[PDB]
Amino acid sequence: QLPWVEKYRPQVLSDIVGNKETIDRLQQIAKDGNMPHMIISGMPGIGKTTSVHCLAHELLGRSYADGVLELNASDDRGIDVVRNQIKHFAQKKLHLPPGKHKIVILDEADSMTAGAQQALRRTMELYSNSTRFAFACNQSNKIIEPLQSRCAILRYSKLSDEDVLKRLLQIIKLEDVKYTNDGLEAIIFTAEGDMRQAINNLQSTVAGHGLVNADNVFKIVDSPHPLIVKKMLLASNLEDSIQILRTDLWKKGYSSIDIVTTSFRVTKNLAQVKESVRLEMIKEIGLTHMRILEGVGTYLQLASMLAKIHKLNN
Amino acid sequence: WVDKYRPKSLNALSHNEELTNFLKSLSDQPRDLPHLLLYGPNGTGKKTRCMALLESIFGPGVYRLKIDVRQFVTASNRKLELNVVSSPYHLEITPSDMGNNDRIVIQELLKEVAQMERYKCVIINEANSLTKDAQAALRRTMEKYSKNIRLIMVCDSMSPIIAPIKSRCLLIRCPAPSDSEISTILSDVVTNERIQLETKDILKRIAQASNGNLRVSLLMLESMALNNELALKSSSPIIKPDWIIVIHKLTRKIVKERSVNSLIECRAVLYDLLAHCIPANIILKELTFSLLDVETLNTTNKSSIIEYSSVFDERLSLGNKAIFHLEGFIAKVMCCLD
Amino acid sequence: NLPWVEKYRPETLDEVYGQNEVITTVRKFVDEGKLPHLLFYGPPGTGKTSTIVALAREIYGKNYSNMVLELNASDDRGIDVVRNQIKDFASTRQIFSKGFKLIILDEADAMTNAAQNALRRVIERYTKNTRFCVLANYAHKLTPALLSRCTRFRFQPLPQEAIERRIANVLVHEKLKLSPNAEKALIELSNGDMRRVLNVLQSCKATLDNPDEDEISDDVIYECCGAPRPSDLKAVLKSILEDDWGTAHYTLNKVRSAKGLALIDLIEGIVKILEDYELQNEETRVHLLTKLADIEYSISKGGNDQIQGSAVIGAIKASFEN
Amino acid sequence: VREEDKLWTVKYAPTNLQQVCGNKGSVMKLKNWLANWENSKKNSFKHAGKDGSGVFRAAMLYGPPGIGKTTAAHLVAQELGYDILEQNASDVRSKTLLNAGVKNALDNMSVVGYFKHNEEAQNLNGKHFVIIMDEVDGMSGGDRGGVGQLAQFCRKTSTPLILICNERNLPKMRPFDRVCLDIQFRRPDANSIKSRLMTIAIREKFKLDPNVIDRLIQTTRGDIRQVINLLSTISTSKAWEKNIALKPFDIAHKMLDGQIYSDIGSRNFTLNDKIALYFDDFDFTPLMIQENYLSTRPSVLKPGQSHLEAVAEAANCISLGDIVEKKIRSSEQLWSLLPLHAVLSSVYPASKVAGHMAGRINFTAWLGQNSKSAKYYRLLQEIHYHTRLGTSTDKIGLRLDYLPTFRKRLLDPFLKQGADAISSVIEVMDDYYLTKEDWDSIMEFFVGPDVTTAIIKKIPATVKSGFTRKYNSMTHP
Amino acid sequence: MLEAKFEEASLFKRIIDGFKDCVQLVNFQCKEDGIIAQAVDDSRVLLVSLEIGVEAFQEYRCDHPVTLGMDLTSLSKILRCGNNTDTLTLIADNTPDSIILLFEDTKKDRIAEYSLKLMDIDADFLKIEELQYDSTLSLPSSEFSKIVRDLSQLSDSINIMITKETIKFVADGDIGSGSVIIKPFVDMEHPETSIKLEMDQPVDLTFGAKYLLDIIKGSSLSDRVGIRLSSEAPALFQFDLKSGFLQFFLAPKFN
């Protein structure tokens, strides 16, 4: 077998779907070649690493194997590496087209020690005539302030719904899969922006149950069913909600964190109730979540959360 | 000025004869002195009592002490330092300069001092800013080393101290000086400083307006003597510090005008007060009591004031950005008073 | 000589209970030979470790001591460990090995985000020469990438039939008699963790083995577990709902003192009892749940015990007024 | 080799000492110290000439990142015609390696400086050394015994030894306490940076709105390299400053709109879209929402809830979101709490007090106030470290009680006694170990009716000169 | 581009190992006259120049002048491989991104070609003008190396004196002091034991110990080392070669 996320990974910059502004920025960068040092920040699985990889590929053409140094969390990045190997790579003579430059792609820059990030400063400041640096990070706060200021910051928003839907439809058309609209909406729901997780859940559903259907997705996700949680959060009499939470969710060994997270996610999408009541229900569920994370996970906390949600809905 | 008239013995004390009698009693046992926990309001002179007790046990040379700096490495790769003022017989640890590394420094320093071998004294200032982990480490240190480290900790409102620590130490309290005794000390001061008083009513007036805080009373007497050319008459416009006047002007602006157009300037004044080394809890307490002092409000408004003040004081003690909670408290106050 | 927790540990796939839905799947995976990376996650005392060790011993037989590497949580777990040990074990190919190795990471939810990123990159790199198996208690503290990379397996708690079968097998292989209500109270208090059951059994064995023939009554089980008996809960609730303030306070105090009761478990039992009453109004239930949750949250930080007890009594009383 | 393919920071680097924007005083101080270091060496570094800058061997540069410290140091060393022997973080500056490499060259001469030009009478310092230790703060764990060895290098040296760091008051930088002179580079003002950006823009044949330039200079918090690097992005035009550069402003503009939270608009813009709008920038959105949530004319008010109640509830939710953010930053592994924070600090107050913007969206100011509070707390901590021997108080009660009367005793004589009270003033200053800098710091911490920045300059400068020249003769410790 | 064929592969190995400890990055300017190189110390105190004419190459063909800037640690790692009785060959292509070093055995087909990645260095090439040095002398390299290795065990500075046709080395450390003097003389029996001297002004200089210890490593190239000292100019140490020279320019100390 073969993972779809690995098989259908975009190799050309145009195939990347998502942020429309920064992808066009990188398109013009590859068209010109004068790429500056850049940090790329954003939430996981929204197309950070693939973006910089495609950029380097399209920018260097046939010389990618000789003019690119990649360093992820697997490779050793301490003090000796940044002082010896990176410095000897930056000085390496290489005759490229007039606009191109050697590229150093540092993925998961957050794991790089601050003391290790110190050494990179003069190494990237001095040899900026034949070497450019591209950091890829989740949180741009763990990068030291000097490196934070030396390079251009590129933020990647979380994926919307129409973009993930378009990508999934492309994948289905290329793979000739049987599906339905409710299944795709369930994929969008369980993904919430993670293109990688969306594609993986799609492939797992197709491999396990063949047909992309709501019950199949909700049986392969191992998460509480969104319909039953919505019924819990929308029952008229409180005892019905308490009985639902007791018998249908608490007995089957679900983790309280998962229950609160699913309630949060379904309350976000309840497009039938008003907006203010949604915000207040989210506030209550979030207070209950903060209580849960502090060490107490008794059923009484979820019962009180449901009670307060009903008190608000009345 | 004030430090020039600071007692240097239990006999030189001129206040709380019960307390000085009990300390003279306790100083009869230099070989067995239990741990002491002094608690009482600010400016009562607990540090004076502690240093006088030390002078009674040890020599009178305990008051000539030298400052020192000590830097150490933690479990991680951070090397941080503190400043301890030490004497030939005692040392004063003030775990206030450091934010969260109280436990490591207290553990290391106590374990290092407890291997010098007749014992040594460790004075813990601000015993309420100690994280519970640091407090537990201190209690275990007390449990281990008891023949070289006799702990004396001064603090105020000793609620953030776990009962495991209260059990081992002797709880001693220092009540604020009554207005009569404050007036007596002020009279002694103006006598030894030949200040030309027109009457003795100014002393009682200062004692009343000082709210039983001895050191701020002495210091405001100092501040007023240099504005009347050492001749204090009956018409004395009592001088308040700058931040108190700012807080009172803020209170008057809150009472007189109730709108967001004034809330902007209120936030500006809060920013200006905070950025000049002033805590949040002090601002909140002063603003609350000032708003309660105003005579135009009824009892329901005062009850709402104190309830919101309690809620936002809890939230200030739980949060980290004080301007948010202060602006929220003032907004709720303006809402209720509207 | 060794404790029952270590003695009665299963050694084959047949000696696991209440997990048939996963046992058939792992048997399909071992007969197919296409065993991918696995994630076993669930509440403690369920059989994840036992199942994976039995599966490894079945697949590799005697080569288990060579092609199976077990690693636990925070073994000096910097990025350096994932760079050296796991990476060498994955990359290095044995002299006479056919197939793939197995690296089982026990309680591997205590890894930092950087450590989990290193692990996901490693499993991505050498996914053709070895397969991994990650064990977890809470599947919400893992990076979604590592979760998506492998196949999930949730370990639902042990049902009543499985635990009853296991305690029967333990009983017939030991010198103990067990009363009818004893197993009922046992299953009610254990909540479905086999480890706690095998612990408390040998505990009450060593506790009441005076004539080698005493019967384990519910008293000794409630003592060894440190849980209240439902009769005391009903009695204290009755006293609160019926008597006045002083008598109810004294009753609560004596019940929580003479037996050693924590307010947390007492509140759990009290709300469990109140869950099945025929309350006519609704505001009573809402106020009760809210105030009791607030009491539990405040107890979680260790206030003044008597104050929280009086607050519990006041909430229960003021809730039942309609 | 090409004029274009170089970055915009290296291509537009300063060349003289009149293009360095901001901090002219510190540059002139460094230049006048380096020029007179020769005569200071002649006098064995014991005669402090007219500035107290004749006894120190090493100069130390510090300040926020992106001001020109490295550029100023290099240009000052080059103007005098010296030869720059530079070592930085990328070199292993251990104790043994420093003793081997640099220590043997503290007093030697240069070969390249000799052979470059030695016949024409330009300047006699064409062959001397100027050792620049850049990023001394960057001494990581792999450089053992570096800070102490450099502190020892400060003394016993024979050539100008410039040092550069980013945080002077860091404990690791303590061994540089009094053994070297230390000047400070402040964040440049908006006028000089605006002039430099205008020069660059007209030089690159493109014009921008001055308001956008002001917003940029505000966002970058005074960093010049950062704003230049961000401006270089214009070539790759409202889309540029709308999407990439001025993102938090547009986030605040979209969130505070009144048409979104309406029923007609909410059906087109879901709550998930607003949470994504927050996630766009989760570092500046809470502060931006808190700064200007009370400067809009609302339109979503309830029938019976005035503006004050709405702003009060918004501030309550802001406080709750602040608590949630603190809980999040207590342990990063709880990033799952990030969406909840999203609704508390960001979405809820905006939805509560949305409407139409009255004026213009003002950037957040909490960062500058936090920096000012940190600086003043450091100064007060130093003052207490000095005065603790004879006050018997805590670091916070000092500012509360003692500071007003201290200011009175230290200044008010200068208002009524004229200038003969200096012998008394220093007397008080001799009792509390205070210095002239301590006097300035004490004079600084005052707000309200007792503002001193206006009053301080009213006294005659002759009194200041006499006080300074009289304090120089005595020393208490 | 260029094809250079050494007669004995040990020659370039000794050349590189002679000064591989004073400079980390060196530039080799390949012209038609031969190979010229100059490199400054990392502390800008000790310059190293090297000239090797076409007479030292069995066959040397250069299409057009080029600059091969390579490391010395990697070049020493590569040159450490080949045996002595081989035929080293240096080859470079147009726009050289890497140099090729062939090792061929005369009586075998064992050809071993290695590749080395060239570095990029800013050509801070200063030009050296001949100066009339006051004192010019020449002495056996073993004698000078022994004297330096003996004197350096005392302090970190060595003082040289040339006065009235007398050479003097002096060292004064904390553990003691030491002094050596040399008188010029010559012997027809073995001219490799003669100490030449041509003095125009008595000169007194002081040099660093570590730099002299790094310089004396060149004693393996030749046996007669020449020294040129001036009153204030940097000292010149010269080791002659069958087709060229290796020169160390050393900067004096201050009083």
Ligand SMILES: Nc1ncnc2c1ncn2[C@@H]1O[C@H](COP(=O)(O)OP(=O)(O)OP(O)(O)=S)[C@@H](O)[C@H]1O
């Ligand atoms: N916009 C996109 N279009 C198509 N595929 C995408 C997109 N974004 C993510 N993916 C898929 O997601 C997979 C995961 O790779 P990346 O997105 O590069 O991971 P990442 O963004 O670096 O997140 P990390 O590694 O956890 S910080 C890719 O192999 C793609 O198949």
Ligand SMILES: Nc1ncnc2c1ncn2[C@@H]1O[C@H](COP(=O)(O)OP(=O)(O)OP(O)(O)=S)[C@@H](O)[C@H]1O
């Ligand atoms: N399904 C089961 N069937 C039979 N015995 C079991 C079962 N689960 C647990 N046990 C017993 O309980 C012991 C503990 O099992 P473990 O596999 O260690 O539990 P666990 O799944 O690893 O949960 P942890 O380690 O607390 S996270 C085993 O050695 C057995 O004796």
Ligand SMILES: Nc1ncnc2c1ncn2[C@@H]1O[C@H](COP(=O)(O)OP(=O)(O)OP(O)(O)=S)[C@@H](O)[C@H]1O
């Ligand atoms: N005053 C200034 N005017 C114009 N450009 C400046 C100025 N200061 C810095 N720069 C820019 O910044 C580049 C050099 O950065 P520096 O500010 O010298 O770095 P730095 O001051 O050492 O701060 P670090 O290294 O991050 S702690 C110059 O080439 C300019 O592009």
Ligand SMILES: Nc1ncnc2c1ncn2[C@@H]1O[C@H](COP(=O)(O)OP(=O)(O)O)[C@@H](O)[C@H]1O
């Ligand atoms: N018995 C006393 N007689 C005279 N002055 C006193 C007496 N007790 C306290 N004081 C004065 O009170 C001042 C403040 O006391 P201190 O211990 O500094 O308060 P805090 O505990 O707030 O630091 C001291 O300067 C001291 O002069």
Ligand SMILES: [Mg+2]
């Ligand atoms: Mg990535």
Ligand SMILES: [Mg+2]
């Ligand atoms: Mg286990």
Ligand SMILES: [Mg+2]
């Ligand atoms: Mg710099």
